[PDB]
TrEMBL record, chains B, G:
Keyword set, alphabetical order: Receptor
Residues of the ORF68 C-terminal domain: 108-229
Organism (species): Staphylococcus phage 812
Source species, domain of life: Viruses
Parent-protein residues present: 230 to 458 of 458
Protein name: Receptor binding protein
Automatic annotation (TrEMBL), chain C:
Record protein name field: TmpF
Range within the parent protein: 2 to 106 of 1019
Species the sequence originates in: Staphylococcus phage 812
Entry superkingdom: Viruses
From TrEMBL, chain F:
Superkingdom of source: Viruses
Native species: Staphylococcus phage 812
Protein name: Uncharacterized protein
TrEMBL record, chain H:
Protein name (database record): Baseplate component
Lineage: Viruses, Duplodnaviria, Heunggongvirae, Uroviricota, Caudoviricetes
Domain of life: Viruses
Full protein segment contained here: 280 to 348 of 348
Source organism: Staphylococcus phage 812
Length: 70, 229, 105, 96, 208, 153, 229, 69
């Protein structure tokens, strides 16, 4: 699927946290919540990049398995 | 053809109107000499002109169009004025007095680019100008304050100018101080410092940074685009 | 499974009625929403692995592998249809050649 | 086939008798109804510009029933005073 | 560190006390800085006092805000140092300011005359031969034009322009698609001296 | 006593959009300056094989970032030099670790985050970002551990 | 002379051109009355004028020349504008709306007198201006600074104005404050003061003295001559 | 290096398919591929124009003399 970068996922998480009935929380740098959000975002980015690489590998392997052409 | 000695325009042979004084760099004549030659030849006293850019002694460096006004065609003691407009729209005025030629006065010009109330704490905020900053050579930034203490019951400063040349810096730095309070035996007037840093890009401006030495709200409130051509 | 079901069994799972502001509930809701959106994306990834439903860049990859590249201002459906049809040239027959001329016309 | 229009044909909204009479007839075609719904409770979370504007769900807002900080839902911290604390502005803003 | 009026409380609970507050903000909580940075800055200060040296002269040319691309050149007959600004090549007022300001670190005699870099433009009408009847498109045309323009911009302004290199850059694309490129406007290998600089211009790709 | 360097890396190392979270400053470390001069002047030994098909091999040179965004390409070089500088001292000749400080690695990570965020827009070149994110957390461990190492040694 | 109802110029008895309005202090008439009288006597609506210096209600104190513009010669409800130039090349503009006269709007003027980069540590150095300082009543001194500590990553200030009335002081003194650093990381915002003292002599200016609180070069970079006539 | 250039050119001459002109651009790009920086420029004396090969011609033999400037 479409590739999502860290900054977009982090902004979306921040917006969900703010809209989720939470005004006390802050997302300044150095905070624990901001670091956890960034880490989760980077994990999702890694997952999307590995998914795209697996899709490419899958296409190649299906084309190999298809026909008898190797 | 017989009225042109009074009139602002020449008449070409096809009956088309034009200027009675044209001055080109190829003519190898100063603006001053071209005027003297023109009065000597025609006996005109008020007339329009084109001067090509790079003509020596021209009101301005660019090509210009303008009006020369005088009441008496005496080139041996000439008295008169001109008003000239450049290809960029700059205005210049000048005069000749007993044939001596005065230094050309260039008028500055301005446009209000933005107004409002942007707090010094609003760092990383961007707002639209009414024009592109590249149409200016200088900028005034305005700031409106409250001092820490009250002096004779008031803490307002009025709205303070900061004028800059547009040198291409990534920050333009409004910075300064106040003295505030009334001096008692137990309590001297306090001193404070302030800063706000701004940047410009095309038709937009950004509040980059600040410092405040009290809990009140300080604001950027006007941006004026200035030309001193 | 989903992030709610596995998370530490003593933590809350629903809005508090004592107060309106719940940072706990905000965090868990945000993480749940993100990981369920990722789950939806991953289920939709199955369609891109098949030529029958591949779209945009994956259809382009399929075409490039089959040698049928995308014509300028060509939508996905016609481009997929031409890619599939391209295998069935049956070249050499007179009626094949007539079909190829009708396509070219 | 000669026709009359019947514009601001009125009922001060009879929510008990909902059949609101268009007494000019036979009606060829309807054009508009407009009237006074109440927002019973809307979150206007405060925007950043202290002592000034925040924006409503409506530009057609014309009468502000209640404005209040929430101790919890409707349970009020401060209920604000109209023209003193906030005012209505724009027909589109609670405005401090 | 804390701003004024932040404590507001005392832990000893003696009811005589009404209120407490710090009249001035605390700013004496200095951070911990290792001596490495101190030593570095001291050494930098000590090296900046050198006079009549290539590196010191170069450093001294950096004080002007518009002087960015300083390049050092040496010649006994007439030493020269070249510099330019981002807005353009060089102005007269800036050049005079550079001449006058560099004297603080020049050697004796001041036998310098700085000239502004002589920009030159390149125009190419290249014909490009492609053996692929599907990838043929204005996308490839635009990509090759961008590549050529960037390569022209990527030159180190010292005899870097040659037709062979341009051919090799064009042939960096896979040879399955690219077959032949025939330059026609480049009739010789342009080798600007160290005074001038060669840069991109109007650059065309026509397909064949 | 220096391991010979690959031809690729040696060629690579010898020479608007803006992100809201992290921004660069184009500042080089003292240790990175000294290495750059060493490679510029002295003829370091170099290898002849290119078996290792990783790192800048067909990834940093294959991408179009070199021609499209040369400024961004200048950030990547700085990170490589700063990444190659720290690896230089620890493996061999530790005498040069005296010039490194905390701020040297701090600015490098900020430069890493900015170029990494920009590369996230491109969908083709995510392979480069894959290594940069792993390298990003590597610099942070040095950042939070370098002041202890010098005092210990 | 059958055209003189429209001409910017009169036709004198010899056929020489001149202004259709000449206003002298010997006439004992205000500029406003001289304009009204001229329109009443001629029915002209757009015409040139000379006003001697010392005429009451004149656009300016000095002798001046200008153009008056209107579309309708109704002196009982005059609508129109004027543009005037003085013997010093000053410019003045104004209007009449319904035979009410607006206050005259004198333009300021300027010239760039010097640009470059002189280090604050070059005290006793003198440089040329483009003009004699005695042609100006006001001066703007521009200075460009690099602060003691970085703000968000930057230490540049932009290029800052300092405007002085030319009271014949032996040293005009730029002095002020930059807030430097940020109250962040673990660092106070180190305030710095500065001074530079400068002087002017005919077509030259001298950097007389300076006071700086850090190890970075600070500069004088522009000098503008201002007239507010 | 001379021997290596001779062997590279001779190898380029072999492993070439039938019915293709003796393109010189690909030859120079192939020999410059060895080192972009070390190798500066390459020129030729007589085969500057592409030699058109017939359907039954293959360009495989050829003696290579290197003349360094």
């Amino acid at each position: 699927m479409k590739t999502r970068k860290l900054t977009n996922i982090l902004s979306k998480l921040i917006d969900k946290t703010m809209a989720g009935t939470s005004k006390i929380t802050d997302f300044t740098p150095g905070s624990a919540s901001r670091s956890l959000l960034e880490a989760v975002s980077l994990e999702i980015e890694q997952f999307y990049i590995l998914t795209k690489e697996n899709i490419d590998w899958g296409i190649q392997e299906g084309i190999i398995e298809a026909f008898d052409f190797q | 053809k017989d009225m042109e000695k009074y009139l602002l325009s020449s008449i070409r042979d096809d009956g088309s109107a034009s200027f009675p004084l044209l001055v080109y760099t190829s003519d190898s004549k100063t603006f001053q000499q071209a005027i003297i030659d023109h009065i000597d030849r025609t006996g005109q006293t008020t007339f329009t002109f084109y001067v090509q850019g790079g003509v020596s002694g021209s009101p301005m460096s660019n090509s210009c169009r303008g009006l020369f006004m005088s009441d008496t065609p005496n080139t041996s003691s000439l008295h008169g004025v001109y008003n000239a407009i450049g290809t960029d729209g700059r205005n210049v005025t000048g005069s000749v007095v007993g044939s001596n030629w005065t230094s050309p006065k260039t008028s500055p010009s301005h446009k209000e680019l933005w107004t409002g109330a942007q707090s010094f704490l609003s760092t990383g905020t961007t707002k639209n100008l009414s024009d592109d900053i590249s149409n200016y050579s200088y900028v005034e930034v305005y700031t409106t304050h409250k001092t820490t203490e009250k002096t004779k019951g008031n803490d307002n400063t009025g709205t303070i100018c900061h004028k800059f040349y547009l040198d291409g810096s990534g920050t333009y730095v409004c910075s300064g101080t106040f003295v505030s309070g009334d001096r008692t035996d137990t309590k001297p007037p306090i001193t404070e410092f302030y800063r706000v840093g701004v940047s410009f890009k095309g038709s937009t401006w950004t509040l980059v940074d600040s410092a405040v030495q009290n809990s009140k709200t300080q604001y950027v409130t006007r941006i004026i685009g200035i030309n001193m051509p | 499974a989903n992030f709610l079901k596995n998370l530490h069994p003593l933590l809350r799972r629903d809005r508090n009625k004592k107060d309106n502001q719940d940072p706990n509930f905000a965090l868990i809701d945000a993480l749940n929403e993100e990981m369920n959106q990722v789950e939806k994306d991953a289920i939709e990834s199955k369609l891109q692995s098949s030529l029958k439903t591949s779209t945009s860049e994956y259809l382009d990859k399929f075409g490039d592998w089959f040698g049928v590249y995308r014509k300028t201002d060509e939508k996905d459906d016609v481009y997929r249809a031409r890619i599939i049809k391209y295998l069935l040239l049956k070249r050499g027959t007179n009626n094949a050649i007539i079909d190829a001329i009708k396509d070219y016309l | 086939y000669d026709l009359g229009t019947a514009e601001n044909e009125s009922t001060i909204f009879n929510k008990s008798n909902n059949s609101i009479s268009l007494a000019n007839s036979p009606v060829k075609e309807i054009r508009r109804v407009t009237g006074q719904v109440l927002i019973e409770k809307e979150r206007v979370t405060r925007g950043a510009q202290g002592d000034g504007q925040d924006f409503l769900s409506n530009n057609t807002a014309f009468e502000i029933v209640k404005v209040w900080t929430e101790t919890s839902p409707g349970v009020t911290t401060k209920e604000y005073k109209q023209g003193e604390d906030f005012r209505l502005t724009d027909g589109q803003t609670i405005d401090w | 560190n804390v701003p004024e009026g932040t404590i507001n409380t005392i832990a000893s609970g003696s009811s005589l006390i009404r209120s407490v507050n710090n009249e001035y903000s605390f700013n004496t909580g200095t951070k911990e800085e290792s001596q490495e940075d101190f030593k570095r800055r001291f050494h930098s200060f000590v090296e900046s006092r050198g006079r009549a040296t290539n590196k010191s002269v170069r450093y001294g040319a950096l004080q002007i805000p518009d002087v960015e691309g300083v390049y050092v050149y040496e010649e006994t007959g007439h030493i020269t140092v070249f510099a330019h600004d981002r807005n353009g090549n060089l102005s007269d007022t800036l050049k005079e300011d550079i001449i006058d300001a560099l004297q603080d670190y020049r050697p004796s005699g001041i036998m310098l005359d700085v000239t502004g870099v002589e920009k030159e433009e390149v125009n190419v009408s290249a014909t490009v031969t492609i053996s692929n009847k599907s990838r043929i498109g204005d996308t490839l045309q635009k990509h090759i034009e961008s590549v050529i323009r960037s390569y022209l911009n990527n030159l180190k302004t010292s005899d870097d322009l040659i037709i062979t290199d341009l051919i090799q850059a064009i042939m960096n694309i896979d040879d399955v698609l690219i077959y032949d490129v025939s330059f026609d406007n480049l009739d010789e290998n342009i080798i600007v001296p160290p005074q001038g600089i060669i840069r991109a211009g109007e650059i065309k790709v026509e397909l064949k | 006593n220096f391991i010979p360097q690959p031809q690729g890396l040696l060629r690579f190392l010898n020479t608007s959009f803006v992100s809201k979270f992290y921004t660069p400053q184009l500042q080089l470390s003292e240790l990175a300056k000294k290495v750059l001069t060493n490679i510029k002047t002295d003829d370091i030994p170099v290898l002849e094989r290119e078996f290792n098909d990783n790192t800048i091999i067909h990834k940093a040179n294959d991408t179009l970032l070199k021609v499209q965004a040369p400024r961004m390409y200048m950030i990547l070089q700085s990170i490589v030099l700063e990444a190659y500088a720290i690896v230089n001292c620890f493996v061999e000749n530790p005498s040069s670790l005296k010039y490194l400080t905390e701020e040297d690695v701090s600015i490098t990570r900020e430069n890493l985050n900015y170029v990494a965020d920009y590369l996230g827009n491109y969908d083709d070149y995510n392979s480069v970002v894959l290594d940069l994110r792993d390298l990003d957390l590597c610099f942070s461990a040095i950042e939070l551990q370098l002041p202890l190492i010098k005092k210990e040694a």
